[PDB]
Amino acid sequence: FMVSLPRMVYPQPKVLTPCRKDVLVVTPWLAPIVWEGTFNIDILNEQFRLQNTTIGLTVFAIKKYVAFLKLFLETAEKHFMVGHRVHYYVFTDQPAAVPRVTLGTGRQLSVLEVGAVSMRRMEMISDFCERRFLSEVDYLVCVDVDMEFRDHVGVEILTPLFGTLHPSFYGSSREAFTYERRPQSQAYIPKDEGDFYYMGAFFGGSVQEVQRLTRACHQAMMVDQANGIEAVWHDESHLNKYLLRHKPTKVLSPEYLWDQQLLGWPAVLRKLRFTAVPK
């Protein structure tokens, strides 16, 4: 049950004035594509705070990648779901290397130790922490650690299932996408199929939908392993196959996954929100 929004004063949306004319803001299956200028964050914040929404954020920091945690977490505190309930889940082989980061109120961090590559992330999210995530959070957001937040990443992303447009491929035609192209792989996508190329570094949704996605990808990766094949881009190849066959209910624009050193700051990006750190 959703209680009423309070009175709010904000600019009237105008039917004959688009928010953005330079980009696609809705997919052909009627999922919003999230760009700056498409959302009023005050309305969304109200809607999600009225539901007392809790967001879980999973991040893996294994071997040398523990070095990225301090900047990742400190910038998440500045920019990620501020004002909402957040539970960070840090999967690591080195619990003692997790930096002590000061958190805002209503935010918590759990260190989840894993044993000392390819299948780990999907397997861990789907086999290991199922009951815990279902009890503790409403949405799960699953991101790479070799990253920093530079600008707002908030409840505009939340939806039953989302993926994020890969920053190197958003202008590419589907035949150029680096999908798995061998029919012997479960991740196979023919050259005449595909909506978008989603990056493995930022996906999410409701706990149920994320567990479905990660379970399916893990099972598909296990089939490939049994058949002696490894998809060209590993879990990203499987993620792409899953999201082709199970359409996401929002798609995040490359504002949400960018590499400025590689790709600069194109006119189409009004904000760079979550960006690669050099490695």
Ligand X SMILES: O=c1ccn([C@@H]2O[C@H](COP(=O)(O)OP(=O)(O)O[C@H]3O[C@H](CO)[C@H](O)[C@H](O)[C@H]3O)[C@@H](O)[C@H]2O)c(=O)[nH]1
Ligand Y SMILES: CCCCCCCCO[C@@H]1O[C@H](CO)[C@H](O)C[C@H]1O[C@@H]1O[C@@H](C)[C@@H](O)[C@@H](O)[C@@H]1O
Contact pick of 235, 240, 242, 243 for ligand X (by CB under 6 A): 235
Residue window 14-53: x/- pattern of binding to its own copies, with contact defined by CB under 8 A? xxxxxxxxxxxxxxxxxxxxx---xxx--xx--x------
Name which position in 150, 174, 181, 271 contacts its own copies (CB under 8 A).
174
Closest residue by beta carbon to ligand Y: 178
Residue 60 DSSP SS3: strand
CA–CA separation, 189 and 211 (whole Å): 22
Determine which residue in the list 77, 123, 138, 144 makes contact with ligand X, applying CB under 6 A.
144
Whose CA is closest to 172, among 191, 145, 190, 196?
196
Do 112 and 120 meet the contact criterion of CB atoms below 8 Å apart? no
Question: In the set 138, 144, 156, 195, which binds Mn ion (CB under 5 A)?
Answer: 144
Interface mask toward ligand X for 179-198; x: CB under 6 A: --------------------
92 - beta bridge partners? 61, 113
Q: Is 61 annotated as a binding residue?
A: yes
Q: Which residue has the tokens 């996906």?
A: 203
Buried b (16+ CB within 10 A) or exposed e, 20-30: eeeeebebeee
Query: Minimum distance from CB of 222 to Mn ion (Å)?
Result: 23
Residues of span 182-201 touching Mn ion by CB under 5 A: 201
Where the chain is broken, by preceding residue (C–N > 2.5 Å)?
116
Nearest distance from C-beta of residue 131 to its own copies, angstroms: 19
3-class secondary-structure state, position 197: coil
Q: Which DSSP helix (H) or strand (E) runs through 71? A: helix 69-79
Question: Could you list the residues that contact its own copies (CB under 8 A)?
Answer: 1-2, 4-5, 7-10, 12-34, 38-40, 43-44, 47, 156, 165, 170-171, 173-174, 190, 192-196, 212, 244-247, 250, 253, 268
Question: Could you list the residues that contact ligand X (CB under 6 A)?
Answer: 60-63, 65, 144-146, 199-201, 233-236
